Design an enzyme around this catalytic site. Sequence first.
Site, short mmCIF file in Angstrom:
data_model
loop_
_atom_site.label_atom_id
_atom_site.label_comp_id
_atom_site.label_asym_id
_atom_site.label_seq_id
_atom_site.Cartn_x
_atom_site.Cartn_y
_atom_site.Cartn_z
N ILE A 136 67.63 64.75 26.37
CA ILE A 136 68.40 65.43 25.34
C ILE A 136 68.23 64.73 24.00
O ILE A 136 68.07 63.50 23.93
CB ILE A 136 69.90 65.50 25.70
CG1 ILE A 136 70.10 65.83 27.18
CG2 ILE A 136 70.59 66.55 24.85
CD1 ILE A 136 71.55 65.71 27.65
N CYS A 137 68.29 65.51 22.92
CA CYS A 137 68.13 64.97 21.58
C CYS A 137 69.45 65.03 20.80
O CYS A 137 69.52 65.63 19.72
CB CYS A 137 67.01 65.72 20.86
SG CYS A 137 66.40 64.95 19.34
N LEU A 138 70.50 64.40 21.33
CA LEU A 138 71.82 64.42 20.71
C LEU A 138 71.99 63.19 19.83
O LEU A 138 71.54 62.10 20.18
CB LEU A 138 72.94 64.46 21.75
CG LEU A 138 74.41 64.44 21.29
CD1 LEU A 138 74.72 65.51 20.24
CD2 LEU A 138 75.35 64.61 22.47
N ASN A 192 67.18 71.24 21.83
CA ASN A 192 67.36 69.80 21.93
C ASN A 192 67.16 69.30 23.37
O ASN A 192 67.78 68.32 23.78
CB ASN A 192 68.73 69.39 21.40
CG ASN A 192 68.97 69.89 19.99
OD1 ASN A 192 69.88 70.68 19.74
ND2 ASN A 192 68.14 69.42 19.06
#
EC number: 2.3.2.23
Lengths: 149, 160, 161
Positions: free
Chosen positions: A86-88, A79
């Site tokens: 970031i891929c949160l 992520n």
Amino acid sequence: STPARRRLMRDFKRMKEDAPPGVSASPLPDNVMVWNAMIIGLADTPYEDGTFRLLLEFDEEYPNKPPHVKFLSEMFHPNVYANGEICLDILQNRWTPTYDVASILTSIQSLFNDPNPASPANVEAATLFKDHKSQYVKRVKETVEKSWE
Amino acid sequence: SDPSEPLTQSDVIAFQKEALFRCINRRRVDFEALRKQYELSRRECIDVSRKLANIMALIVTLARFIETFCTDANEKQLCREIAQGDETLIVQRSDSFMKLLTKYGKPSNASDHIQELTTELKNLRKSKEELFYENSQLTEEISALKEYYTNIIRKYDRDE
Amino acid sequence: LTQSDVIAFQKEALFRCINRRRVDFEALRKQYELSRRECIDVSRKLANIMALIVTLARFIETFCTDANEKQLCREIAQGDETLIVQRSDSFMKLLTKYGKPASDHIQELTTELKNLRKSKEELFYENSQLTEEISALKEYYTNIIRKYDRDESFTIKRVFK
């Protein structure tokens, strides 16, 4: 002066009286809209004992708008885009203003032990995470050791 | 820094140094365990090669003896060649030599069939023996490593 | 060298120690692989000769008339290096004696073959299990020591409470 700059102050107070384990964070003594953070990787996670530096950039839309966050330290996570983004889920499309800096850093820490190859941002990382798990641990360990510089 | 105190810049460097030692001591333990497996395998090489020298000596002996009874020249040549005590020629011609031993060592169709069978018996035995040697060395390895690791762990226990 | 002392060393040097250890480790590994390749080579070579010999011993046993001769062949065929090197003169004397150029015996040999094939398969399996055990063990013990170093790290205790 603005309410965003005293909310940031409230997060900063949280970061001292109940600083969450394994993280630090502090805005520049001059610029409160910019914060140095750092995260430590958890035990029994392949990111164990790491020391990853993070930069947070804030505008006057806070806490309505989440800040821009990227790791400065070299990273290797599914992520994590190579620029540090970031891929949160609670940063893009599940963000609420009641999340502070302390809850953001820790909501990121959790990603280490619990990655999410469902929304992969680094192809290689999500790949090895399913093919050569041992080799994946090797690359993460390179990441960790470099983080100590 | 007090647990109830924003971690300071000195604190972080300190954490990293203990994490460094942990890593250093981990690669050090892993290294010296390799040291032990290595010393062991050198001891084992010494020992198998001393045995090898010696049974090859018996092979040379055996090859000379048979040569004295060979009828055909290709047979004589094989014995003399084996008899030189070359360690490879005897793998490459192990079958043909076995057949010579069963051909002359003894004082129709059945005879030739027993030759085939005994050759096969030799090959199987060879395999059994390879495996037996490998397994012995492996068990020794396990024992060496166990003795190594357990002492470090017990040194930590004596550290209370 | 010990954990408590790491505070006194310098970070830049700890990295160098890590590279020192990494290169020396690859060196020892290349050595270890060399060593093992040699041991297998010599062990396969020795296996072949002993096989030739114990096959011979059993072959000639079906001829020796004396019970000392029969016992000789049997003991040799038990396959010990020492006892073979040490009784090889008498063995040769035997061979000199009897070399001067039905059904039930062949059944015996096929029985010999079957049991040996079983043994080989048994040992191959056990070989495999041992390799796995080695792997398991190294992982097990190093995990334990890693924990021990984490239990006397005070930096860990303060970072994590």
